[PDB]
Structures are given as C-alpha cells and as structure tokens.
Amino acid sequence: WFGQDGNNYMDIADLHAALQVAPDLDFLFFDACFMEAVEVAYALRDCGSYLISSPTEIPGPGAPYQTVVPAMFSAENAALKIASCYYDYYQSRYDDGIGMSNEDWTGGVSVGVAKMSELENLAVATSKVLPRYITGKQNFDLSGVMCYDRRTDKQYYYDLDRFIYQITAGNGDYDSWREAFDKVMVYWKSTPRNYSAYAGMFTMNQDAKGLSTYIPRMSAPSLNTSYQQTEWYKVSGWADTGWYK
Amino acid sequence: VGSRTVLVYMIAQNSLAPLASADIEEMKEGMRQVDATSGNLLVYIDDYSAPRLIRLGKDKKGKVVEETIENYPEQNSADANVMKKVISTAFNQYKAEKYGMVFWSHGEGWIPSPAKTR
Ligand SMILES: [Cl-]
Ligand code: NA
Ligand code: NA
Ligand code: NA
Ligand code: NA
Ligand code: NA
Ligand code: NA
Ligand code: NA
Ligand code: NA
Fold first, then answer.
1. DSSP assignment, residue B1?
2. Domain map of chain A by residue range?
3. Cross-chain residue pair B29–A60, CB shorter than 8 Å
4. Residue A28 · residue A40 · CB < 8 Å
5. Which residues are within 8 A (CB) of B26 and not within 5 positions of it... i.e. 6 or more apart?
6. For residue B7, is it within any domain?
7. At A160, phi and psi to the nearest 5?
C-alpha cells in the first residue's frame, strides 16, 4: 500500500484508479518507503514515464527539497536529477550511521529510477523464466539475494535481479532476462549501508539493482494469496509456477 | 512554453506529521532558484489540521509565498476519490508543457491495506 491517513491506507489498485484523472506524468516520485517495487512499477506503468523511490526504507527527513525542487523543474532528465540530488545529499553526510538522527542523517540512502515503458517487456521476460525454474512449491534458498526488508518477521522485499540470478544459477536464461531488465533501471545509487528503523544500519549488497520483488513463503499463505491480486502476478509467470499452478 | 506543473501529495496525518513542515519549508527554499512564472509547484498537505491545496509561487518582489488554491474539510487523503479531486483541481487549474507528481507519506510497496471492510 501507500499512504497512511489515520487508520486508512491506499491500496495500489486504488492509487492507480486515482491517477487516471492525472495527465501523463514525467515522473512519479515516491518519497516513501519500499515503493521501488516491480509490482508498483508495473501497476503504475500507464501513469507516467519514470518511477522514483527506494526499494527499502526511506529516511525520515526524506528528500532535500531545497535541491530536489529545482531538479523537478529541469528542462529534461528531471527524474534522473531528482534521484541524483536525493542521493548526493545523503552520501555527502554519510558516516556509516554514526550519530544517526533525523536532524543529522548519517545513515545514507538508496535511490532508484525505473523506466515504466519497459515494464511490459520485463513481464514478458520474467514469464519465460519463472514457470521454467519454479516447478515445485517450496521455500527458496535466498542467501546472497539482497533483502530490502530488514523486519525479520516480514521480509517482504527482495532484489528482483538477484532472485532471477539465483533460480537460474546465472545461466543463459539469466542473460536473456538480464537484457530486458537492463532497460528498466536507469538509475541506482546507494551508500555502502542504509539505516533501518527496525534493524539499524544494514549492508546494501553491491550486486543489488534497486528494484524489489515479492517472494512466496510457507509462513505467509494469506500474503501469498494477496499477491495473486497484483497485476504483476498475472503477467510475471508466477501463476504458472509450482507455487500457484 | 517550457512550463511544468508538479503536485506534491502529502498524506501526513501520521507519525510523519512533525516532519512535514521542514520539507515544505525546504520546498520554498528550493523554489527560490526556480522560474515561478512557468513552473508550478502545488502542494497538498494533510497533517494534524485541515487539508489544504496551496501553490508555492513568488510575490512581485521574488519572495516565495504560499497561495491557497483550495481548503478542504477533514477527510481521508488516502481515499482515491479524494486524491482524484485534488489531482483534478491541481492540474486543470495549472496546465503545462510537462507534469510530475510527488508522493509523500508512509510506504509499504504492493502490500494490501492492513485494515479492510467486507
Ligand atoms: Cl541480505
Ligand atoms: Na520495495
Ligand atoms: Na527534507
Ligand atoms: Na547520511
Ligand atoms: Na545480493
Ligand atoms: Na525491458
Ligand atoms: Na515478482
Ligand atoms: Na488532517
Ligand atoms: Na485526513
């Protein structure tokens, strides 16, 4: 979901429905947690050109709007300039979380920009992989696959690229898929570590690409069911895996 | 025309409410080095007081000033039709060559709402 108004939270489907009255946007900047997800990118691919957020947690003080606002009004490449501004600010003050606070953020940050128009190609690419390499229903061996979710009782978001790499053992099918994915993330920068309000400073794996994905798990059948409601699920090939078929 | 309109949508009626003010002030500061004749920065802010749609324009002296576009009764800003109304008001009043939108709140990816009715 996105947005919390008291005890209300906007489902992504409802958000998409709302953005239909919006003109086509150059960028959709989510100064909010966990929004750089393939499922959000795909669901909102028709609302704009670029998705800007973090696959993991966003710092409380958020964007340096003293520099981000001018970035938003650039002639062109606003999306890239928004991201680079956001990143450069926190990397300049990065001190591996020493003396971390809202008023002095030394925990760094990670920002990615996704090209929305390539999300359909990515869904096609992914559908060629998932049923073929996920024939059974079983918890995955996810060691080495960057987890953007530092809440060990949730662990919702994993790096999509590293996950596809894992299940294909980086074979020739990965390279094919990787070609399609390379066209999606146009920006991805991160400090060596980020700050989690749940776990503290955590390492951002150097091979992470900045776009998250969900992964089914035996512990959360209700959430596996909920994932069948996403539009990405319907086109990603997950329906034809051993987890859902 | 080179003009651009950006709506910043702040669902701040939460734990981030104390942080909303700083960002808005940072926006004014950033708006200073922005051509306020062609660039339109609109801000919807719903914190611990009544929602309001404003515009961060410059006065005739160049000082960044808040311009009230519409005031709202208290409402769920995480509701689609509420967002629709604000989006409609924002962009229809300020058509431009390019557009952008900022989403300012708590986030949890694709995950369904933790509270549902049936
Ligand atoms: Cl990890
Ligand atoms: Na995410
Ligand atoms: Na800020
Ligand atoms: Na920092
Ligand atoms: Na990794
Ligand atoms: Na692609
Ligand atoms: Na997926
Ligand atoms: Na309010
Ligand atoms: Na409200």
1. -
2. 1-245
3. no
4. no
5. A63, A64, A65, A66, A69
6. yes
7. -60, -45
Range of the domain at B1: 1-106
Structural domain contains residue B85: yes
CA distance A9 to B108: 10
CATH of the domain at B73: 3.40.50.11970
B114 within domain boundaries: no
Helix axes A172-181, A160-167, angle to 10 degrees: 160
The tally of domains found in chain B comes to 1
Question: Per the CB < 8 Å rule, is A73 touching B80?
Answer: no
Ligand 2 center to residue A41 CA distance, Å? 10
What is the enclosing helix (H) or strand (E) of B82? helix B80-93
The position carrying tokens 């062109």 is A76
* Structure obtained using: X-ray
Say which of A3, A39, A72 has its CB closest to residue B100: A72
Q: What is the experimental resolution, given in Å to one decimal place?
A: 2.5
User: Which residues of B are less than 8 Å from A39 in CB distance?
Assistant: 109-110
Phi, psi of A128 (to 5 degrees): -80, -15
Amino acid identity of residue A221, one-letter, is P
Q: Is residue B67 part of a domain?
A: yes
